[PDB]
Design a protein around this ligand. Structure first.
Ligand SMILES: N=C(N)NCCCC[C@H](N)C(=O)O
Length: 336
């Protein structure tokens, strides 16, 4: 149910060399200079990869684009960080550049003023003490399926994930719209503005650095949690709908029992059709955040220096869509 590409060793080496050159010439991935240049530098990537990315983005069916075979040397990478705060390590640096180059072929990268301190390239790794939370640094508790940043109209079109290491083969989960099982009445209701979707816990002050917790953009998050506006779960074409839902942060509109039944049914059908994608070391996935929800299976964290670790990036097809929320400015979204 996804589109897959495997780099030849020569293609993988060339992409890696390009990323290393970028890491040599630019101070950081999230600086204005590399943010502007990366999409044009990405034109230098191996042609067969550029062809795959251009065409697979235009296919109607895939839930994700997956690129296999980027080499990662665990000795050069170093230990998995204890927290995302300290995760911009020299060993991970070139792979962060690599992810952004790949992302530049699909759209405009951006971050949130209220998530991981406004970073564009973010980290997914288990944090000691946070095993049973609702954020991506969880482990022992499964990360429930979700549209990334479901609460926001400016949420990503694609979510990029690059596996730095995943020694125990922990699966990312995915599901599309269960169109084979949704009856027309239920479908009709899911297309109506009868649902509430609150921001997830990654946007809370407690999950950002103490220095950031006075930022005005947390006000907007509070407003969205306290007074969510009713929206639709499904949009667009009835035979191939786009999806906006989060299994732990969605609810029906107040007292709307038909909407509740529709969401209840959708939960069961998504639970039933959820499938696994294992991102091995060096694998990159770009998840279609309109066609699919995603999550991550429960796993026992190691905390020994070799935990599963991904770099992540949010991608939009059009940054100008979010101008009302430009905060840091165009590339870091948030509102009062
Ligand atoms: N059903 C759940 N858990 N929803 C929230 C998922 C985590 C989202 C957030 N971007 C993060 O990286 O933590």
């Amino acid at each position: 149910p996804w589109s897959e590409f495997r780099l030849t060793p020569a293609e993988a080496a060339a992409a890696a060399a390009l990323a290393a050159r970028c890491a040599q010439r630019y101070d950081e991935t999230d600086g204005p200079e590399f943010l502007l240049d990366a999409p044009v530098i990405a034109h230098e990537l191996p042609r067969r990869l550029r062809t795959f990315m251009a065409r697979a983005r235009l296919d109607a069916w895939p839930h994700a684009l997956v690129v296999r075979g980027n080499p990662v040397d665990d000795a050069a990478l170093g230990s998995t960080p204890v927290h995302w705060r300290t995760a911009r390590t020299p060993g991970s640096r070139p792979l962060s550049f690599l992810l952004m180059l790949y992302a530049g072929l699909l759209g405009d990268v951006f971050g949130w003023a209220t998530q991981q301190d406004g970073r564009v390239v973010t980290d997914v790794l288990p944090i000691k003490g946070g095993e049973h939370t609702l954020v991506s640094s969880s482990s022992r508790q499964e990360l429930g399926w979700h549209t990334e940043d479901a609460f926001s109209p400016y949420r990503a079109d694609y979510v990029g994930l690059l596996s730095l290491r995943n020694p125990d083969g922990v699966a990312t989960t995915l599901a599309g719209v269960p169109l084979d099982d949704l009856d027309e009445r239920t479908l009709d209701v899911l297309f109506q503005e009868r649902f509430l979707i609150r921001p997830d816990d990654s946007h809370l002050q407690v999950n950002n650095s103490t220095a950031q917790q006075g930022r005005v953009e947390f006000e907007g998050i509070a407003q969205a949690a306290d007074r969510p506006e009713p929206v639709a779960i499904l949009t667009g074409h009835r035979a191939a709908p786009h999806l906006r839902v989060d299994g732990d942060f969605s609810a029906p509109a107040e007292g709307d029992e038909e909407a509740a039944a529709a969401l209840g049914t959708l939960r069961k059908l998504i639970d039933a059709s959820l499938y696994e994608l294992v991102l091995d070391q060096g694998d990159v996935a770009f998840i279609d955040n309109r066609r699919a929800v995603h999550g991550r299976r429960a796993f026992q964290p190691r905390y020994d220096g070799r935990d599963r670790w991904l770099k992540r990036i949010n991608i939009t097809r059009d940054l100008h869509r979010s101008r009302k929320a430009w905060a840091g400015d165009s590339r870091v979204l948030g509102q009062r």
